[PDB]
Design a binder for these strands. Structure first.
Length: 66
DNA sequence: ATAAGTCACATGGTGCCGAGGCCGCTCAATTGGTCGTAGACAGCTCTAGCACCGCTTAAACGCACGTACGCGCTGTCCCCCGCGTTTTAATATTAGTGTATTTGATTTCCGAAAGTTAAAAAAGAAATAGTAAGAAATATATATTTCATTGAA
């Protein structure tokens, strides 16, 4: 779930009958609109570890050598 | 006779404090207006529950008889109370921790409210099957006829 804000959907704060706290929003999923979710603040992970693996090769061939 | 100087004397004026009066600020209470809404009021037509009466009889009252249980008497036995003397925790006094409720603040939740809108359904008509009564089909028992056979006119 990864809930760290516990703050309601800003577009959904208008009619805040429920708040499922799901990403992007349970109310938006009921509403079927992800674009409206992006318009608000509203507080993708498998590429960071491979890039860190790649960093070791980068700093050896740029900073140390070259 | 008078200008100038002395001495006291009576009053003018300026200043902070005290007491009374007015005013503004705020909060609560009260009342009038207003308008959506509901209740009183006629008004009408309909169910519907008494008055009567016949009647048929199930039920009820009355008189007489008796015996099944209510109570009274008398024994005999168990059976809580009454003291007397030991035991034993209730109980009031501090007290300390560690829960356990309560109050503000807030912030995210949940349903009253209003407006459309579609489904459940209610009434009425038609189909159809259940059931009872009637008529026909038929199986069966019995009389009747006819022929054969064997004994009488």
């Amino acid at each position: 779930t990864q809930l760290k804000s516990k703050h309601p959907c800003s577009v959904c704060t208008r009619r805040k009958v429920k708040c499922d706290r799901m990403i992007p929003c349970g109310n938006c999923r009921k509403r079927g609109q992800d674009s409206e979710c992006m318009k608000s603040t509203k507080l993708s992970k498998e590429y960071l570890p491979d890039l860190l693996l790649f960093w070791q090769n980068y700093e050896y061939w740029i900073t140390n050598i070259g």
